[PDB]
Enzyme design. Structure first.
Site, PDB file in Angstrom:
ATOM      1  CE  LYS A 299      -2.767  -2.974   2.945  1.00 23.11           C
ATOM      2  NZ  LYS A 299      -1.693  -3.503   3.817  1.00 23.11           N
TER       3      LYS A 299
ATOM      4  CG  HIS B 157      -2.522   1.933   3.627  1.00 19.31           C
ATOM      5  ND1 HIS B 157      -1.303   1.584   4.169  1.00 19.31           N
ATOM      6  CD2 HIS B 157      -3.440   1.394   4.451  1.00 19.31           C
ATOM      7  CE1 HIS B 157      -1.474   0.862   5.257  1.00 19.31           C
ATOM      8  NE2 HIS B 157      -2.778   0.722   5.447  1.00 19.31           N
TER       9      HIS B 157
HETATM   10  N1  NAP Z   1      -5.836  -1.679   4.624  1.00 16.74           N
HETATM   11  C1  NAP Z   1      -5.744  -1.225   5.844  1.00 16.74           C
HETATM   12  O1  NAP Z   1      -6.074  -0.114   6.255  1.00 16.74           O
HETATM   13  C2  NAP Z   1      -5.543  -2.262   6.950  1.00 16.74           C
HETATM   14  C3  NAP Z   1      -5.934  -1.934   8.287  1.00 16.74           C
HETATM   15  C4  NAP Z   1      -5.773  -2.851   9.340  1.00 16.74           C
HETATM   16  C5  NAP Z   1      -5.210  -4.128   9.052  1.00 16.74           C
HETATM   17  N2  NAP Z   1      -4.843  -4.364   7.701  1.00 16.74           N
HETATM   18  C6  NAP Z   1      -4.124  -5.665   7.355  1.00 16.74           C
HETATM   19  O2  NAP Z   1      -4.981  -6.654   7.955  1.00 16.74           O
HETATM   20  C7  NAP Z   1      -4.208  -7.592   8.781  1.00 16.74           C
HETATM   21  C8  NAP Z   1      -5.091  -8.232   9.829  1.00 16.74           C
HETATM   22  O3  NAP Z   1      -5.668  -7.264  10.709  1.00 16.74           O
HETATM   23  P1  NAP Z   1      -5.070  -6.888  12.131  1.00 16.74           P
HETATM   24  O4  NAP Z   1      -3.585  -6.991  12.223  1.00 16.74           O
HETATM   25  O5  NAP Z   1      -5.620  -5.521  12.435  1.00 16.74           O
HETATM   26  O6  NAP Z   1      -5.733  -7.894  13.197  1.00 16.74           O
HETATM   27  P2  NAP Z   1      -6.346  -9.398  13.159  1.00 16.74           P
HETATM   28  O7  NAP Z   1      -5.723 -10.154  12.067  1.00 16.74           O
HETATM   29  O8  NAP Z   1      -7.810  -9.230  13.203  1.00 16.74           O
HETATM   30  O9  NAP Z   1      -5.901  -9.838  14.638  1.00 16.74           O
HETATM   31  C9  NAP Z   1      -4.501  -9.999  14.866  1.00 16.74           C
HETATM   32  C10 NAP Z   1      -4.399 -10.247  16.411  1.00 16.74           C
HETATM   33  O10 NAP Z   1      -4.968 -11.588  16.579  1.00 16.74           O
HETATM   34  C11 NAP Z   1      -4.103 -12.450  17.258  1.00 16.74           C
HETATM   35  N3  NAP Z   1      -4.307 -13.761  16.733  1.00 16.74           N
HETATM   36  C12 NAP Z   1      -3.997 -14.258  15.498  1.00 16.74           C
HETATM   37  N4  NAP Z   1      -4.320 -15.526  15.320  1.00 16.74           N
HETATM   38  C13 NAP Z   1      -4.873 -15.847  16.542  1.00 16.74           C
HETATM   39  C14 NAP Z   1      -5.399 -17.090  16.924  1.00 16.74           C
HETATM   40  N5  NAP Z   1      -5.428 -18.149  16.127  1.00 16.74           N
HETATM   41  N6  NAP Z   1      -5.903 -17.153  18.214  1.00 16.74           N
HETATM   42  C15 NAP Z   1      -5.879 -16.042  19.065  1.00 16.74           C
HETATM   43  N7  NAP Z   1      -5.359 -14.834  18.674  1.00 16.74           N
HETATM   44  C16 NAP Z   1      -4.866 -14.777  17.390  1.00 16.74           C
HETATM   45  C17 NAP Z   1      -2.707 -11.928  16.958  1.00 16.74           C
HETATM   46  O11 NAP Z   1      -1.764 -12.268  17.979  1.00 16.74           O
HETATM   47  P3  NAP Z   1      -0.194 -12.680  17.666  1.00 16.74           P
HETATM   48  O12 NAP Z   1       0.262 -12.000  16.413  1.00 16.74           O
HETATM   49  O13 NAP Z   1       0.533 -12.166  18.910  1.00 16.74           O
HETATM   50  O14 NAP Z   1      -0.188 -14.232  17.540  1.00 16.74           O
HETATM   51  C18 NAP Z   1      -2.906 -10.381  16.876  1.00 16.74           C
HETATM   52  O15 NAP Z   1      -2.926  -9.802  18.177  1.00 16.74           O
HETATM   53  C19 NAP Z   1      -3.076  -6.626   9.263  1.00 16.74           C
HETATM   54  O16 NAP Z   1      -2.009  -7.245   9.931  1.00 16.74           O
HETATM   55  C20 NAP Z   1      -2.765  -5.882   7.969  1.00 16.74           C
HETATM   56  O17 NAP Z   1      -1.996  -6.757   7.124  1.00 16.74           O
HETATM   57  C21 NAP Z   1      -4.985  -3.492   6.632  1.00 16.74           C
HETATM   58  O1  393 Z   2      -3.891   1.535   8.417  1.00 16.88           O
HETATM   59  C1  393 Z   2      -3.547   0.417   8.735  1.00 16.88           C
HETATM   60  O2  393 Z   2      -3.262  -0.476   7.805  1.00 16.88           O
HETATM   61  C2  393 Z   2      -3.405  -0.066  10.156  1.00 16.88           C
HETATM   62  O3  393 Z   2      -3.506   1.107  10.987  1.00 16.88           O
HETATM   63  C3  393 Z   2      -2.337   1.796  11.183  1.00 16.88           C
HETATM   64  C4  393 Z   2      -1.084   1.214  11.108  1.00 16.88           C
HETATM   65  C5  393 Z   2       0.111   1.901  11.305  1.00 16.88           C
HETATM   66 CL1  393 Z   2       1.566   1.373  11.235  1.00 16.88          CL
HETATM   67  C6  393 Z   2       0.052   3.271  11.599  1.00 16.88           C
HETATM   68  C7  393 Z   2      -1.217   3.836  11.672  1.00 16.88           C
HETATM   69  C8  393 Z   2      -2.417   3.180  11.481  1.00 16.88           C
HETATM   70  C9  393 Z   2      -3.738   3.888  11.582  1.00 16.88           C
HETATM   71  O4  393 Z   2      -3.929   4.750  12.435  1.00 16.88           O
HETATM   72  N1  393 Z   2      -4.625   3.639  10.595  1.00 16.88           N
HETATM   73  C10 393 Z   2      -5.930   4.233  10.585  1.00 16.88           C
HETATM   74  C11 393 Z   2      -6.111   5.394   9.616  1.00 16.88           C
HETATM   75  C12 393 Z   2      -5.101   5.829   8.777  1.00 16.88           C
HETATM   76  C13 393 Z   2      -5.329   6.879   7.877  1.00 16.88           C
HETATM   77  C14 393 Z   2      -6.621   7.438   7.817  1.00 16.88           C
HETATM   78  C15 393 Z   2      -7.654   6.981   8.629  1.00 16.88           C
HETATM   79  N2  393 Z   2      -8.905   7.575   8.529  1.00 16.88           N
HETATM   80  O5  393 Z   2      -9.766   7.112   9.294  1.00 16.88           O
HETATM   81  O6  393 Z   2      -9.124   8.499   7.731  1.00 16.88           O
HETATM   82  C16 393 Z   2      -7.416   5.931   9.531  1.00 16.88           C
END
Ligand code: NAP
Ligand code: 393
Length: 315
Positions: free
Chosen positions: A77, A110
């Protein structure tokens, strides 16, 4: 079926590994283990400030002869401070150099919000207001298009765009490439039916982020709802002899979504992939959809005055 067809002819694995909050100290091993147990899709971003270490793990497994590059589906992103046309190629190349790759399978805008350019990823003023940039979604999109036309990325898309913002791009005069993917927050507390309906009816594939509720999000309050601890979902899991995470991962899979659960814990990375051996029932799916509370893990009050803030709109 492991992979979904994009509007660029490529196939995207429907289960990938998230890397937000995976410490540089621990994400190389995480990615190595992930590749070993069958993950082919890694979701990255520059703002996650761990792309080098992700790259380390990929390079090695290519070196070990475990996988070939063509087998991998690497996503990154474009961060908000890089929305200016003149900055986009550079930002992409930094990600590519960090990851030690020649191309990305998918490159996303992103967030629709452009922030003031500079080193600071989240420039603020003095009432928690993010300092925006004088950029717009259309011009940024055109800059992404150029990335495809130069071979740096095979497909482009968006993340956290509402349906009107997707429409803006779709309806752009002189569009070169349609967005292939819209990556949004999605789980039983934010089920996104109208936006999924919309994107799927446009041939845009949806990727569900935070499928487990992001318990490790750094702004969590102890009062917020916790998906992995929800009794109602634990009950669905126990009847299937699966864990709650497995159920939370399988759920979007049955909605024709891509899902990208994050873990750095080797046991959990392996468990989270073991979701192709069971099926949620019709009653399970409508039960989980009925838990929608329209609750967002990812929504910044500091951005709610930005002109492209995405969540004022219903969907
Ligand atoms: N496009 C965007 O704006 C955006 C925003 C947010 C996230 N994302 C992407 O989405 C991915 C997933 O979302 P997320 O990181 O927010 O959270 P998530 O995947 O919903 O949750 C991750 C949390 O769940 C725990 N976990 C994972 N597997 C588990 C299991 N089997 N049992 C119990 N706990 C478990 C992990 O712990 P441990 O790691 O300590 O095992 C971590 O604390 C991100 O990492 C990122 O790549 C993109
Ligand atoms: O965005 C992600 O993938 C996960 O969230 C992260 C991760 C990192 Cl390393 C740093 C900051 C953020 C975060 O505050 N994201 C939320 C966000 C950003 C921009 C705008 C918005 N918005 O609402 O307009 C929200």
């Amino acid at each position: 079926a492991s992979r979904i067809l994009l509007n660029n002819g490529a196939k995207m694995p429907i289960l990938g590994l998230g890397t937000w909050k995976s410490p540089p100290g621990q994400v190389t091993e995480a990615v190595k283990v992930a590749i070993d147990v069958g993950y082919r899709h890694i979701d990255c971003a520059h703002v996650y400030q761990n792309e080098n270490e992700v790259g380390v793990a990929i390079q090695e497994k290519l070196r070990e002869q475990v996988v070939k590059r063509e087998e991998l589906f690497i996503v990154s992103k474009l961060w908000c401070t890089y929305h200016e046309k003149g900055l986009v190629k550079g930002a992409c190349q930094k990600t590519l150099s960090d990851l030690k790759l020649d191309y990305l399978d998918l490159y996303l805008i992103h967030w629709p919000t452009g922030f003031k350019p500079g080193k600071e990823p989240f420039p603020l003023d003095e009432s928690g207001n993010v300092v925006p940039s004088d950029t717009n979604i259309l011009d940024t999109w055109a800059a992404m298009e150029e990335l495809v036309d130069e071979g740096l990325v095979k497909a482009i898309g968006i993340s956290n765009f509402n349906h009107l913002q997707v429409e803006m791009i779709l309806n752009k005069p002189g569009l070169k490439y349609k967005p292939a993917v819209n990556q949004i927050e999605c789980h039983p507390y934010l089920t996104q039916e109208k936006l999924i309906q919309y994107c799927q009816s446009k041939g845009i594939v949806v990727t569900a982020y935070s499928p487990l509720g992001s318990p490790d999000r750094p702004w969590a309050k102890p009062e917020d709802p916790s998906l992995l601890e929800d009794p109602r979902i634990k009950a669905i899991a126990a009847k299937h002899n699966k864990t709650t995470a497995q159920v939370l991962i399988r759920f979007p899979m049955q909605r024709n979504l891509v899902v990208i659960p994050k873990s750095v814990t080797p046991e959990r990375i392996a468990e989270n992939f073991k979701v192709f051996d069971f099926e949620l029932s019709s009653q399970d799916m409508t039960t989980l959809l009925s838990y929608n509370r329209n609750w967002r893990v990812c929504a910044l009050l500091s951005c709610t005055s930005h002109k492209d803030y995405p969540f004022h709109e219903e969907f």
